[PDB]
Amino acid sequence: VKKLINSQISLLIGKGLHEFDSLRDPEVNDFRTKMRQFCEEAAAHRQQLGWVEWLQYSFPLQLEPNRALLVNVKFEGSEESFTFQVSTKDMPLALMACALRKKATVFRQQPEEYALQVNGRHEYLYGNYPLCHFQYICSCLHSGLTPHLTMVHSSSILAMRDEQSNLWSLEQPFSIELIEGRKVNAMKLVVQAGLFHGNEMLCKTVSSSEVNVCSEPVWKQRLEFDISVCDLPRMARLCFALYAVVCPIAWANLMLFDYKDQLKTGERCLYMWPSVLLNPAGTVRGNPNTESAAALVIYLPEVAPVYFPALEKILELLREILEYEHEKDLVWKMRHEVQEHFPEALARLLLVTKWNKHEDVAQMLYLLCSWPELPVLSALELLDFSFPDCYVGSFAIKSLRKLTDDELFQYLLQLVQVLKYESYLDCELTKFLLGRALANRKIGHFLFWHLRSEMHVPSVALRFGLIMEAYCRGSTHHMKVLMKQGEALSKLKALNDFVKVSSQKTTKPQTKEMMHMCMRQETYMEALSHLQSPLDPSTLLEEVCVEQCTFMDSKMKPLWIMYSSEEAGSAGNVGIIFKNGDDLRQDMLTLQMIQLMDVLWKQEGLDLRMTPYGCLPTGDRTGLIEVVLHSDTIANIQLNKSNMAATAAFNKDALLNWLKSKNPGEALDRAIEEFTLSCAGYCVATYVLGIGDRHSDNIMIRESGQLFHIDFGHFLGNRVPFILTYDFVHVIQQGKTNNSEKFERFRGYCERAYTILRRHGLLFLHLFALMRAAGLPELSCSKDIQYLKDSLALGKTEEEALKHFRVKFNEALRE
Ligand SMILES: CC[C@H](Nc1ncnc2nc[nH]c12)c1nc2cccc(F)c2c(=O)n1-c1ccccc1
């Protein structure tokens, strides 16, 4: 009934729906009701999409950011295949008319009625783009492999669709009364309060009296702030630090206006969070661990039922050098000049805006509502917490709406982290994310896992749980596809626990055949088979190949799980790596950032042949990593074993002999080149990102020659030199001792890659800035972000920045 759906939702999101109701919170109840209706409405929009439109929804196109190729095409019901010779400039439709024509001239006698599906993948070829513009067609073109497509009729596509159906007056100073407190430590106690607007103070901080530490203390003391009530901005938050003195203890935050714009009065009790002192960016909701949390009771005086004013009320109420408070000055009362001729300097203007005086806010807000929509880049900036105003927030979302799904996919990790800055449940960002997720099934997929992966974190468990419930309201079908994934994940965790225990008392071979017998149980085989990969929903994991599964007998004992699809061929031969105990958040950001570099590089005609493999936290220190097959570790290669084709007279030849043995004849030149581009790319990626501890065990190489890094762990120096491994350098130089020709080719690739990224330095700064919200220990300060600015060197000219890169590069061929 409606009871099955709720029950599955509770199971899927890892928090029982009954818990939301137990809260008796009308903000929560109104979110669940408003957002439910919102998502149910998208669902009904979706179930009457035209078949091409539904293809777009469910299998969005994977495009790259003259020549002839061999193609193989069949139909759904058939087993019979045709192999054609088409161009690369040919549209998909051209391909489809060929297929249909030979179907006639084989079965005896309209392209528009079909789409092309990659065999064994939820991925399709359609639209007026030449074949080479397709990522699948491209991967094939570089691996020598032949594309395998299936002609799928609009009437079967329609089947899939249906299958998935379902006030200014108050001029007295702001003051609170600090009543009591409720938990203990070790000395005297102090409560520091601060009115904050984002990260800036609306006035001086105000402390309290000192009382003896034990208790359950009592102040009943009146804290009054240097700020009038009528000047409290909408998004103003009051922040408390509780600590000790002759020693940090707890913090807690509260909005002065509720989620209904009403100014807060009366007494409220604050269940604090443990520290290490004021913490303005911390969540504005209480600690859910009410049992053992210090509690802070305060009283907000009832200054009359005063609402924050409607906007209609609010609206009625040398300089280019800069592109000091003798500089703000001229930005602010030349504000109109900034709207006229510098509409992109909005951020700067909002920053010199004093937010502690209401009639200033109104004049900014008056300019804001007439402000021309801004570029995505600028928009990404405005989402930062340093622009806490809810109207700036809406402007930002509004300027963000022109995000393509690819861009949105690319930035989604950040946007999701920014949810932790939000002051209320119901907000524009969330509505924006659910709207986009419901419009694109891949976005939906990853929005879900980013939220799901943090349900063990109580700061966000409620917000994130609510958001997943709403989404689940929007696609009952995808919810079940997603449960399917989580039943797989649940199994791998129990499997991994077994292997960990087993391997502490048993040889590896015997634990492996033990792992296998466990996988062979009915329960496992069913749960682990026939799902979409959480790493990429267009990858289908069909039959788990048990004999090819194993584990690494290192540390966390990660699992190696292989799959096959008797209908995808070699494209269905795919693996996933499950790891439990390590924190995979660091690696996901790094590999996301490397993916972006790769895109930026490729849009300026530079392909450094990167391997940005999937990496996905799915839970508390739990996740999946994408298996890159036909690759081996440098360390393994460098072992220089006997009886191997790669066996070498000098250790430095090992890497190259291995390459020769995998790439005989004139195949060899291609692999050196791939090695060269990919090494260039990774050297630069790790330098900019400040990723040290790079060694032969966390660098791998593909039989094609491509090199790629793994297990990044940290980034941002937590100052890393550029590095150059002589062993890589001597693959690049083709085995030859000196080879400036081939060494400077590579120097060029490094420089070109470096300068290209430099040109997009603002994008990386904006993205990393928003990631501060994620709570990665490597990404906290301003000196973390300063690290990126120096590795990209944006405080300098392209000419002299290149000169600084050359010295570090040259210092790096030290070895
Ligand atoms: C750490 C190196 C390596 N990591 C990776 N191997 C393949 N694709 C990857 N994608 C990300 N990390 C990728 C690895 N990771 C594993 C993880 C779990 C279970 C395992 F058996 C392995 C394993 O055997 N290797 C391995 C080692 C030496 C050669 C070949 C593969």
mmCIF file of N, CA and C in Angstrom, residues 187-234:
data_model
loop_
_atom_site.group_PDB
_atom_site.id
_atom_site.type_symbol
_atom_site.label_atom_id
_atom_site.label_comp_id
_atom_site.label_asym_id
_atom_site.label_seq_id
_atom_site.Cartn_x
_atom_site.Cartn_y
_atom_site.Cartn_z
ATOM 1 N N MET A 187 38.352 25.411 38.458
ATOM 2 C CA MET A 187 38.112 26.076 37.168
ATOM 3 C C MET A 187 36.726 26.701 37.051
ATOM 4 N N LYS A 188 36.607 27.656 36.134
ATOM 5 C CA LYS A 188 35.372 28.416 35.981
ATOM 6 C C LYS A 188 34.803 28.323 34.562
ATOM 7 N N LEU A 189 33.578 28.816 34.386
ATOM 8 C CA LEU A 189 32.855 28.716 33.114
ATOM 9 C C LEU A 189 32.484 30.077 32.499
ATOM 10 N N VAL A 190 32.487 30.146 31.160
ATOM 11 C CA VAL A 190 32.128 31.359 30.414
ATOM 12 C C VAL A 190 31.310 31.006 29.176
ATOM 13 N N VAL A 191 30.304 31.828 28.894
ATOM 14 C CA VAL A 191 29.541 31.763 27.661
ATOM 15 C C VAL A 191 29.863 33.008 26.854
ATOM 16 N N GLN A 192 30.381 32.794 25.647
ATOM 17 C CA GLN A 192 30.754 33.908 24.778
ATOM 18 C C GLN A 192 29.560 33.984 23.806
ATOM 19 N N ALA A 193 28.914 35.115 23.576
ATOM 20 C CA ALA A 193 27.921 35.080 22.472
ATOM 21 C C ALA A 193 28.360 36.016 21.340
ATOM 22 N N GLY A 194 27.924 35.737 20.121
ATOM 23 C CA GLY A 194 28.235 36.607 19.005
ATOM 24 C C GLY A 194 27.081 36.597 18.028
ATOM 25 N N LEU A 195 26.621 37.778 17.621
ATOM 26 C CA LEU A 195 25.662 37.863 16.525
ATOM 27 C C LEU A 195 26.471 37.835 15.249
ATOM 28 N N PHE A 196 26.255 36.815 14.428
ATOM 29 C CA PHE A 196 26.978 36.713 13.164
ATOM 30 C C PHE A 196 26.020 36.760 11.975
ATOM 31 N N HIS A 197 26.479 37.416 10.917
ATOM 32 C CA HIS A 197 25.897 37.328 9.582
ATOM 33 C C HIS A 197 26.881 36.579 8.687
ATOM 34 N N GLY A 198 26.678 35.281 8.501
ATOM 35 C CA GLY A 198 27.704 34.479 7.865
ATOM 36 C C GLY A 198 28.933 34.443 8.767
ATOM 37 N N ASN A 199 30.096 34.810 8.231
ATOM 38 C CA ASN A 199 31.329 34.774 9.019
ATOM 39 C C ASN A 199 31.766 36.140 9.569
ATOM 40 N N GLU A 200 30.926 37.157 9.418
ATOM 41 C CA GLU A 200 31.277 38.486 9.910
ATOM 42 C C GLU A 200 30.379 38.930 11.075
ATOM 43 N N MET A 201 30.983 39.604 12.048
ATOM 44 C CA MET A 201 30.273 39.993 13.262
ATOM 45 C C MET A 201 29.357 41.172 13.003
ATOM 46 N N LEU A 202 28.130 41.073 13.486
ATOM 47 C CA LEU A 202 27.205 42.191 13.420
ATOM 48 C C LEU A 202 27.502 43.225 14.531
ATOM 49 N N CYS A 203 28.377 42.843 15.460
ATOM 50 C CA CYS A 203 28.796 43.702 16.568
ATOM 51 C C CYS A 203 29.886 42.989 17.356
ATOM 52 N N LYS A 204 30.332 43.590 18.451
ATOM 53 C CA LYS A 204 31.335 42.950 19.293
ATOM 54 C C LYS A 204 30.765 41.682 19.928
ATOM 55 N N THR A 205 31.628 40.726 20.235
ATOM 56 C CA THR A 205 31.206 39.565 21.011
ATOM 57 C C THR A 205 30.911 40.003 22.446
ATOM 58 N N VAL A 206 29.993 39.298 23.107
ATOM 59 C CA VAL A 206 29.662 39.572 24.506
ATOM 60 C C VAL A 206 29.771 38.323 25.377
ATOM 61 N N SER A 207 30.670 38.349 26.357
ATOM 62 C CA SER A 207 30.831 37.235 27.297
ATOM 63 C C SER A 207 29.812 37.254 28.429
ATOM 64 N N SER A 208 30.027 36.398 29.419
ATOM 65 C CA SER A 208 29.185 36.378 30.604
ATOM 66 C C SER A 208 30.060 36.344 31.844
ATOM 67 N N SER A 209 29.417 36.342 33.009
ATOM 68 C CA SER A 209 30.106 36.152 34.279
ATOM 69 C C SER A 209 30.805 34.806 34.337
ATOM 70 N N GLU A 210 31.793 34.704 35.214
ATOM 71 C CA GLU A 210 32.414 33.428 35.518
ATOM 72 C C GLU A 210 31.761 32.783 36.741
ATOM 73 N N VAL A 211 31.314 31.534 36.577
ATOM 74 C CA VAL A 211 30.793 30.695 37.666
ATOM 75 C C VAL A 211 31.601 29.386 37.760
ATOM 76 N N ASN A 212 31.650 28.789 38.952
ATOM 77 C CA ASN A 212 32.354 27.524 39.181
ATOM 78 C C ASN A 212 31.907 26.430 38.224
ATOM 79 N N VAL A 213 32.852 25.596 37.788
ATOM 80 C CA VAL A 213 32.601 24.647 36.698
ATOM 81 C C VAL A 213 31.472 23.647 36.969
ATOM 82 N N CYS A 214 31.524 22.954 38.105
ATOM 83 C CA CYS A 214 30.530 21.917 38.376
ATOM 84 C C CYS A 214 29.138 22.531 38.440
ATOM 85 N N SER A 215 28.120 21.662 38.407
ATOM 86 C CA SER A 215 26.745 21.977 37.983
ATOM 87 C C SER A 215 26.815 22.012 36.430
ATOM 88 N N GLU A 216 25.724 21.993 35.641
ATOM 89 C CA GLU A 216 24.357 22.490 35.882
ATOM 90 C C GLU A 216 24.337 23.964 36.310
ATOM 91 N N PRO A 217 25.175 24.817 35.683
ATOM 92 C CA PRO A 217 25.417 26.156 36.237
ATOM 93 C C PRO A 217 24.257 27.113 36.034
ATOM 94 N N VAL A 218 24.328 28.267 36.692
ATOM 95 C CA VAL A 218 23.250 29.245 36.618
ATOM 96 C C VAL A 218 23.803 30.672 36.537
ATOM 97 N N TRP A 219 23.389 31.407 35.503
ATOM 98 C CA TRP A 219 23.833 32.784 35.306
ATOM 99 C C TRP A 219 22.704 33.803 35.516
ATOM 100 N N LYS A 220 21.481 33.430 35.125
ATOM 101 C CA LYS A 220 20.341 34.356 34.933
ATOM 102 C C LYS A 220 20.782 35.800 34.658
ATOM 103 N N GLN A 221 21.815 35.936 33.829
ATOM 104 C CA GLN A 221 22.471 37.201 33.548
ATOM 105 C C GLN A 221 22.067 37.714 32.166
ATOM 106 N N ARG A 222 21.981 39.031 32.020
ATOM 107 C CA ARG A 222 21.502 39.621 30.779
ATOM 108 C C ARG A 222 22.625 40.062 29.834
ATOM 109 N N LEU A 223 22.759 39.349 28.721
ATOM 110 C CA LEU A 223 23.712 39.736 27.685
ATOM 111 C C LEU A 223 23.036 40.665 26.685
ATOM 112 N N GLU A 224 23.620 41.842 26.502
ATOM 113 C CA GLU A 224 23.065 42.848 25.611
ATOM 114 C C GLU A 224 24.120 43.254 24.597
ATOM 115 N N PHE A 225 23.725 43.330 23.332
ATOM 116 C CA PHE A 225 24.701 43.494 22.261
ATOM 117 C C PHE A 225 24.624 44.889 21.692
ATOM 118 N N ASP A 226 25.748 45.359 21.171
ATOM 119 C CA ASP A 226 25.819 46.678 20.568
ATOM 120 C C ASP A 226 25.229 46.648 19.163
ATOM 121 N N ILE A 227 23.907 46.531 19.093
ATOM 122 C CA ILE A 227 23.184 46.473 17.831
ATOM 123 C C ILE A 227 21.694 46.593 18.108
ATOM 124 N N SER A 228 21.022 47.450 17.352
ATOM 125 C CA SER A 228 19.597 47.638 17.550
ATOM 126 C C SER A 228 18.808 46.514 16.904
ATOM 127 N N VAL A 229 17.667 46.202 17.508
ATOM 128 C CA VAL A 229 16.822 45.118 17.057
ATOM 129 C C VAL A 229 16.417 45.284 15.591
ATOM 130 N N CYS A 230 16.089 46.507 15.183
ATOM 131 C CA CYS A 230 15.626 46.770 13.817
ATOM 132 C C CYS A 230 16.720 46.594 12.763
ATOM 133 N N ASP A 231 17.919 46.244 13.193
ATOM 134 C CA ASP A 231 19.024 46.161 12.253
ATOM 135 C C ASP A 231 19.500 44.727 12.077
ATOM 136 N N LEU A 232 18.832 43.808 12.771
ATOM 137 C CA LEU A 232 19.087 42.386 12.613
ATOM 138 C C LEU A 232 18.682 41.954 11.206
ATOM 139 N N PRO A 233 19.651 41.490 10.401
ATOM 140 C CA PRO A 233 19.237 41.015 9.080
ATOM 141 C C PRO A 233 18.506 39.694 9.186
ATOM 142 N N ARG A 234 17.738 39.400 8.154
ATOM 143 C CA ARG A 234 16.971 38.167 8.031
ATOM 144 C C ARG A 234 17.773 36.902 8.413
#
